[PDB]
C-alpha cells in the first residue's frame, strides 16, 4: 500500500555537472536539473508502483534503520530486454546488468546472457549519535546519457522531520558503462521477520556560485522568476538597485488574411454546360475561352460526371493555375466512346472523328 | 483590423497591422511605398479602401528592481508597447524566456515609454531612484512595501523675492570638502 501526496521541493537537487575545479567563480551551466520550487510526488510505505524514468530522476528518502534495499531499472523488467539492479546488501553493492524475469516479492530467477557484475563500497551509509532521532536523509540523482550510468549522492544529516530548505550539493559516486536503455524504474523493500520522495529532471539553465574550495554555496535559476532571469543574465548573485535590460518582447501574428481582387469574370463555361444543342462528334464545336476566371465549381455543380480524368494537370490542382488559353470541345457521344477518347488511343472515333494528341494538357468531362 | 495579422494583399506578402485611413490615393494608385522603399498602404482590392501596415509588435523588456539585499520584489517594463497587446498576447507564446507573466499587481500602468506590469502609479514628487524614461522614476518605498512609479521631481520648490530694495547677505560661513574622481 502506498500514497501519492504532493509536496514542494524548495531549492534541492543541484550537483556538480562536471569534474573540474572552480574557485570563487559564477560559472553557468545548461544541464539536467530539478526545477526550483517544483512539486515532487511524495510516497508512503506500509504495491511498489513502477515509476517512469525520463532524462533522469531525483530520488530522496529518509528511514529509521533500513526499509529500502535498491532500485530496479531497464525496460519491461522481464527476460526479453536487458535490465539493471542496484540492490544494496549489508556492506556491498550488487550493481549488474541482466535479464531478470520476475519475483513479485530471492529477487530474480534468471541470469541468461548477462554480465557486468560490479561490487564496491555500500551506497547507503547509516550513522547514529547513539540515538534514533538522527535520521539521515539520502538523496540520489540518476541519469543515462550516452549509456554511462551516473549516480550522485550525499546523505544530509538534517534530522528528517521535514523536507529541508537548506542547500546540499551532490557528489558523484559511480559512473559505469551500462550501455542499455532505461525507461522504467522501480524500488525494492526489506524484511525483518515519510520517505520515497521522487522528482523528475528537465534541461534547464542554472547559475552556480562555486566556493573557494570547490564546494557549492548557492545557486539560482533563470526560468523561475523575473529576478532570477536578470540575475542569471547579468551573471552575479547580488544585483545592485537599478534598471536592467534582459531580452526582447515579440508577438507573432495571430491570424493570416489574404485578399485577392473582387474579380468574378465568369467564363463561358456555364454557356457550354447549360447549352442544349451539343454538336456531334463528326463536327466537334470548339469554343475559345479567354479573358475570364476559370472557376471549376460551376463545372462541378452543373454535371454529375462519369469520367473526369486528367492527363497534364491534377484535377484537384486547377484553382491555382493560370492558363494562356483554354479550348472546350463539346460533343455528345456514346458510352464506350467516352473511354475511347484519350491520348494514344485508336478506333472509329479516335481516328476518323476526334483524335486526342499524345501530349495533351487538359481534362475531359463526361456526364450522362 | 487593429490586430497583429499576416497579410497577402494582391501579391504583396508581409506581416503587419491595419486600420482605416484618411488620405487621398489617386484613383489609379494601388500600393504604398516611402523614401527608403518600404511598403505602407495597400488599397483594399475588394473595397477600394486604404489600409496600412506596421511592424508586428517590436519591443524591449526591462526589469526595475531595488537591490536584492532589500527585497525580491521586481517590476517589469516593456519599452514602447501598448499594454493591451502584452496582456492579450501572453497566451500562445514561448514561456521560459519572452516572459509570460500573469498581470496582477496594478499592472498596465501605460506610461509614455511603456508600462510597468507590477508597479503602482502615484502622484508625488520624490527624487529619481531608478530612471525609466519619459519622466518616470520608480522607487522601493514602504506602504507594507511595494514599488511605486511617479513623475520626476526636479527639486524642492523655492522662490526668492526680488524686491527693488531687498538684499540678503550671509552672516556665517561653512567649509566643505567634496570629492572628484578622474
Amino acid at each position: 500500500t502506498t500514497t501519492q501526496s504532493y509536496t514542494n521541493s524548495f531549492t534541492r537537487g543541484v550537483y556538480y555537472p562536471d569534474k573540474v575545479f572552480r574557485s570563487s567563480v559564477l560559472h553557468l551551466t545548461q544541464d539536467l536539473f530539478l526545477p526550483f520550487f517544483s512539486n515532487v510526488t511524495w510516497f508512503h510505505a506500509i504495491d511498489n508502483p513502477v515509476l517512469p524514468f525520463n532524462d533522469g530522476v531525483y530520488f530522496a528518502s529518509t528511514e529509521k534503520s533500513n526499509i529500502i534495499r535498491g532500485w530496479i531499472f531497464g525496460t519491461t523488467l522481464d527476460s526479453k530486454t536487458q535490465s539493471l539492479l542496484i540492490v544494496n546488501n549489508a556492506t556491498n553493492v550488487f550493481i549488474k546488468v541482466c535479464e531478470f524475469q520476475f519475483c513479485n516479492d530471492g529477487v530474480y530467477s534468471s541470469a541468461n546472457n548477462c554480465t557486468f557484475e560490479y561490487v564496491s563500497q555500500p551506497f547507503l551509509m547509516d550513522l547514529e549519535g547513539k540515538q534514533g532521532n538522527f535520521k539521515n536523509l539520502r538523496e540520489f540523482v540518476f541519469k543515462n546519457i550516452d549509456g554511462y550510468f551516473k549516480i550522485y549522492s550525499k546523505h544530509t544529516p538534517i534530522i528528517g522531520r521535514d523536507f529541508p530548505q537548506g542547500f546540499s550539493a551532490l557528489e558523484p559516486l559511480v559512473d559505469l558503462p551500462i550501455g542499455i536503455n532505461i525507461t522504467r524504474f522501480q524500488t525494492l523493500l526489506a524484511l525483518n521477520r515519510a520517505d520515497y520522495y521522487v522528482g523528475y529532471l528537465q534541461p534547464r539553465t542554472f547559475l552556480l556560485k562555486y566556493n573557494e574550495n570547490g564546494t557549492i554555496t548557492d545557486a539560482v535559476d533563470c526560468a523561475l522568476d523575473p529576478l532570477s532571469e536578470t540575475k542569471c543574465t547579468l551573471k552575479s548573485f547580488t544585483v545592485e538597485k537599478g534598471i536592467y535590460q534582459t531580452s526582447n518582447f515579440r508577438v507573432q501574428p495571430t491570424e493570416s488574411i489574404v485578399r485577392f481582387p473582387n474579380v468574378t469574370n465568369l467564363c463561358p463555361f456555364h454557356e457550354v454546360f447549360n447549352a442544349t444543342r451539343f454538336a456531334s462528334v463528326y463536327a466537334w464545336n470548339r469554343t475559345r475561352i479567354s479573358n475570364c476566371v476559370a472557376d471549376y465549381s460551376v463545372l462541378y455543380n452543373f454535371a454529375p460526371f462519369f469520367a473526369f480524368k486528367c492527363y497534364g494537370v491534377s484535377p484537384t490542382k486547377l484553382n491555382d493555375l493560370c492558363f494562356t488559353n483554354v479550348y472546350a470541345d463539346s460533343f455528345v457521344i456514346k458510352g464506350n466512346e467516352v473511354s475511347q477518347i484519350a491520348p494514344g488511343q485508336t478506333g472509329n472515333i479516335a481516328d476518323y472523328n476526334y483524335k486526342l494528341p499524345d501530349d495533351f494538357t487538359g481534362c475531359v468531362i463526361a456526364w450522362n | 483590423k487593429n490586430k497583429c495579422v499576416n497579410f497577402n494583399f494582391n501579391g504583396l506578402t508581409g506581416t503587419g497591422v491595419l486600420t482605416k485611413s484618411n488620405k487621398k490615393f489617386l484613383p489609379f494608385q494601388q500600393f504604398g511605398r516611402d523614401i527608403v522603399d518600404t511598403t505602407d498602404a495597400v488599397r483594399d482590392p475588394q473595397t477600394l479602401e486604404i489600409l496600412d501596415i506596421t511592424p508586428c509588435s517590436f519591443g524591449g523588456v526591462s526589469v526595475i528592481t531595488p537591490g536584492t539585499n532589500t527585497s525580491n520584489q521586481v517590476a517589469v517594463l516593456y519599452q514602447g508597447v501598448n499594454c493591451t497587446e502584452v496582456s492579450v498576447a501572453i497566451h500562445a507564446d514561448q514561456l521560459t524566456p519572452t516572459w509570460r507573466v500573469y498581470s496582477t499587481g496594478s499592472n498596465v500602468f501605460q506610461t509614455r515609454a511603456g508600462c510597468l506590469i507590477g508597479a503602482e502609479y502615484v502622484n508625488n514628487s520624490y527624487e529619481c531612484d531608478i530612471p525609466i524614461g519619459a519622466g518616470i522614476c520608480a522607487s522601493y518605498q514602504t506602504q507594507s512595501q511595494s514599488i511605486i512609479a511617479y513623475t520626476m521631481s526636479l527639486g524642492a520648490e523655492n522662490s526668492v523675492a526680488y524686491s527693488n530694495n531687498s538684499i540678503a547677505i550671509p552672516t556665517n560661513f561653512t567649509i566643505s570638502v567634496t570629492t572628484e574622481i578622474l
Partner: antibody
Amino acid sequence: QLQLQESGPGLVKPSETLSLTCTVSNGSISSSTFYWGWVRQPPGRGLEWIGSIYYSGSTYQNPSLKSRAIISVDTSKNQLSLKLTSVTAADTAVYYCARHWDVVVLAAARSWFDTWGQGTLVTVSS
Amino acid sequence: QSVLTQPPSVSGAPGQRVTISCTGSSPNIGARNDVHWYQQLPGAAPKLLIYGNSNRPSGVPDRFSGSKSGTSASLAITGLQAEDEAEYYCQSYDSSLSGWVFGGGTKLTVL
C-alpha cells in the same frame, strides 16, 4: 491491423461502481513493447487521461482520480478492464481504450497515443 | 487540469494558411518534452497527425506541418479543404503530474 472493441453499460445509477472492458483484435495484449490505457472526454470539454496499465500489473494513474479508478488487465482473454467507483454527475463522458507509451525505445515524455477505440457514450442518471 | 493552453476556435478561407498554437507552463512541461497533435471528427475517435513535433505517420498528408520551440508548439496548414474542419487537440507529458495531459481542444472552421 490492430482493432479495439470496448463495451460497458451506457447507463449507470449514481454512486456505485462503473465498469467497462476493451477487446484487442489482430494482436495480443501480452505485447510487452507497448502500454495500454483509458482516456475519457466529457462532452464539450477536452480529452483527459485516466490511467494506463501494463500487462504485468504496473499501472500509470492520474493522481487527481487516485481514490476512484482501478484498472486491471488479463492476458488470457486479451481483455483490458477498467473500473470506476463513486461515480457522480461530473463523470458523464465517452471512454476510449488506447495503446501508447512504447517501452523499448521511446521515453515517457515522447510517448504518443497511437491506437484509439470507437468509444462508448456512458452517462449517469437518476 | 488544462496545463496546455489552446485557442478556443479559429477559422479561415479554404486553401489558406491557419496556425494552431499550444503552450504550457514552465515548471510543468519542459524543453525536452515533445508535443503531439490529434484530430477528432465529430462523433469519431481522435486521429493522429504529427508526432515528435516534426514527424507524421503513414497516410497523413504533408500539408499538416508542425514545430515546437522551447515550450510553445504550433501547426501550419497549407491548402485548407472542407474535410479539415474537426476538433484538434494538443497533448504532451507533464513531469509534475507524472502523467500525460491534453489541450482544451480548438475548433477549426472552414469559411
